[PDB]
Amino acid sequence: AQNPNCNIMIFHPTKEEFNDFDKYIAYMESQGAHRAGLAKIIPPKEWKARETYDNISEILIATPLQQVASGRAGVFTQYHKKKKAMTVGEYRHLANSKKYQTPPHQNFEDLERKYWKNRIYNSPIYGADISGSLFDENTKQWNLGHLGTIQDLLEKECGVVIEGVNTPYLYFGMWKTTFAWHTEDMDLYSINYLHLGEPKTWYVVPPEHGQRLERLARELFPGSSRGCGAFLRHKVALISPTVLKENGIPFNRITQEAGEFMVTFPYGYHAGFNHGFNCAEAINFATPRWIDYGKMASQCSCGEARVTFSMDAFVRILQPERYDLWKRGQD
Ligand SMILES: O=C(O)CNC(=O)C(=O)O
Ligand SMILES: [Mg+2]
Ligand code: NI
Ligand SMILES: [Zn+2]
């Protein structure tokens, strides 16, 4: 069995190997990459996502989210308070203000320490989940707005034709902005490209051990667990590495830098934070190996998780028994 320790693998495809996306995902899996839950892909030196970023300040963040924490430093939840719209230019200035800027620090490790120590005492503002793309239309390789769609994968594998579309989303971050512990909708893959700016630190639990994280989360957030049998679908809970190590949960960590892709694999729980102002683009995708995970994915039916239009068909076709209850929580 390849990668039996479930380490995060880092790949350096050549320009030739960068031509066929599906093939390269399958290659990474042949090497055991999926066992980690997360992989890093460093693009060939000849590749570029776009010519320059010189013209991004006019993008609108219609609903910036202030991430307010409750709990203790290592075990907390966050809620998103909606703020008034602002442009990327405005947001970048805000990120660089004395209130919100990255503090002095020695290296990524020192900054990680300061994040876990101090996150809960501040409420950073995140421009998340903005439909759009920053890939140039002429970028042919690993262009996240030109991937094969999940609908088309399900059609090719299973023969059924469904509604729905699959488009990318932009994420504008600042110091301390946080993504809570989650897997993807329907335990899909995700791919995330860091277009510009400061790094993003990731934590991941191997898919084969995801249920260990779920059991710990039920212990640590006991009211949330009573409210919903899939409450990590709410995307609100944070658990630090120290707490994970105290409780014997297998995990790994890695820092993504601008110009780098990350792939999360089906049922790979992940969480993380941004180091300073940055912009990422991400999208879900499927492969044939995903279908069995889609069939088994937990679902929130309490009403909190509320997701996209396209998840309907996935639930309806892959999880017909659950469909009625899940849709009640959607409506
Ligand atoms: O970048 C972020 O805030 C969160 N991204 C992801 O969870 C992902 O790409 O799957
Ligand atoms: Mg612009
Ligand atoms: Ni994710
Ligand atoms: Zn729920």
From Swiss-Prot:
Residues 8-50 form the JmjN domain. GO terms for cellular component: blood microparticle; chromatin; nucleoplasm; nucleus; pericentric heterochromatin; site of double-strand break. Coiled coil: none annotated. It is found in: Nucleus. Binds 1 Fe(2+) ion per subunit. It comes from the Eukaryota. The keyword Nucleotide-binding does not apply. One of its GO terms (biological process) is chromatin remodeling. Ubiquitinated via 'Lys-63'-linked ubiquitin chains. Deubiquitinated by USP14 with the help of TRIM14 leading to stabilization. It is an enzyme of class 1 (oxidoreductase). It catalyses: N(6),N(6),N(6)-trimethyl-L-lysyl(9)-[histone H3] + 2 2-oxoglutarate + 2 O2 = N(6)-methyl-L-lysyl(9)-[histone H3] + 2 formaldehyde + 2 succinate + 2 CO2. Fe cation binds at residues 182, 184, 270. The keyword RNA-binding does not apply. This is Lysine-specific demethylase 4D.
